[PDB]
Amino acid sequence: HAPPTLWSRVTKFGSGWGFWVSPTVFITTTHVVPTGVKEFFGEPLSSIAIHQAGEFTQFRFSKKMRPDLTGMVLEEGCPEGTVCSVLIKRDSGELLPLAVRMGAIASMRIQGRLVHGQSGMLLLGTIPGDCGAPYVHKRGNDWVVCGVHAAATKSGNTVVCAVQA
C-alpha cells in the first residue's frame, strides 16, 4: 500500500504530473513541462538545475522545496518482470494506483520523439492527462522509483515510462 506521504510526492505540473524524489529533486516527462514560462514552483529558471534526455526531465532546485520529504532511490528503470505501481492522481483528486508488470528497457520511437523507456503490461487504464506519474515498487522497506509515465499503446493495455540516463 502506498502511504499518504508517498502520494503527496505526486504533484500537478504543466500538462501532467511530476514526483518529488527528495526535498530538492523533482522528476517529470519532458513533454508535459510547460513551455515559454520563466519559473517553476515559484523559483526562477536561473536557480534550477535541469538534466533532460529521452523524455525524462530532472529538476534540482537550490533550496529545499519539500523539507518534509525523506530522499528515496531513483533508479534507471527496474528489473524486467518487476511488478510496479503507477501512482496516478486525476485532476478530480482521485488516487488510482495501477499495477504494471515491467518488460525491457529500450529506445523507442513515439510520435517522432525518441524515448529512453521501459514498457509494461497493465494488471483500469491510463489517460492522456497521466503523463509524469511515477512508477514505483517497494524494495523491502524503502520505496524505489524507476520511471515516469510517458505513453500507452493503441489498445491501452501496454504502457511506457521514460527512465533516466
Ligand X SMILES: *[C@@H](O)[C@@H]1CCC(=O)NCCCCCc2nnc(o2)CC[C@H](NC(=O)OC(C)(C)C)C(=O)N[C@@H](CC2CCCCC2)C(=O)N1
Closer residue to Cl ion in complex, CB, 54/97 = 97
Closer residue to ligand X in complex, CB, 8/153 = 153
Instruction: Give CA separation, 37 vs 42, 43, 45, 96, in Å.
Output: 11, 11, 9, 30
Task: Work out how close the CB of 96 gets to ligand X at its nearest, in angstroms, rounded to a whole number.
Answer: 12
Interface pattern 7-46 for Cl ion (x via CB under 5 A): xx--------------------------------------
Of the candidates 158, 159, 151, 129, the residue with the CA atom closest to the CA atom of residue 56 = 151
Closer residue to ligand X in complex, CB, 56/61 = 56
Which one is catalytic: 78, 84, 116, 131?
A: 131
Task: Work out how close the CB of 36 gets to ligand X at its nearest, in angstroms, rounded to a whole number.
Answer: 17
What DSSP character marks residue 31?
Answer: G
User: What are the cell numbers at 56?
Assistant: 525524462
Measure the CA–CA gap between 97 and 95, rounded to whole angstroms: 6
Tell me if residue 137 is catalytic: no
Task: Work out how close the CB of 158 gets to ligand X at its nearest, in angstroms, rounded to a whole number.
Answer: 8
Instruction: Give CA separation, 46 vs 24, 43, 49, 96, 128, in Å.
Output: 15, 8, 8, 35, 30
Tell me if residue 31 is catalytic: yes
Instruction: Select from ligand X, Cl ion, none the partner in contact with residue 45, using the beta carbon and a kind-dependent cut-off of 5 to 8 Å.
Output: none
Number of H helices, E strands in the chain: 1, 14
Closer residue to ligand X in complex, CB, 67/112 = 112
From 1, 5, 82, 133, residue interacting with Cl ion (rule: CB under 5 A): 5
Tell me if residue 39 is catalytic: no
| Residue that is written with C-alpha cell 534526455 in the block | 53
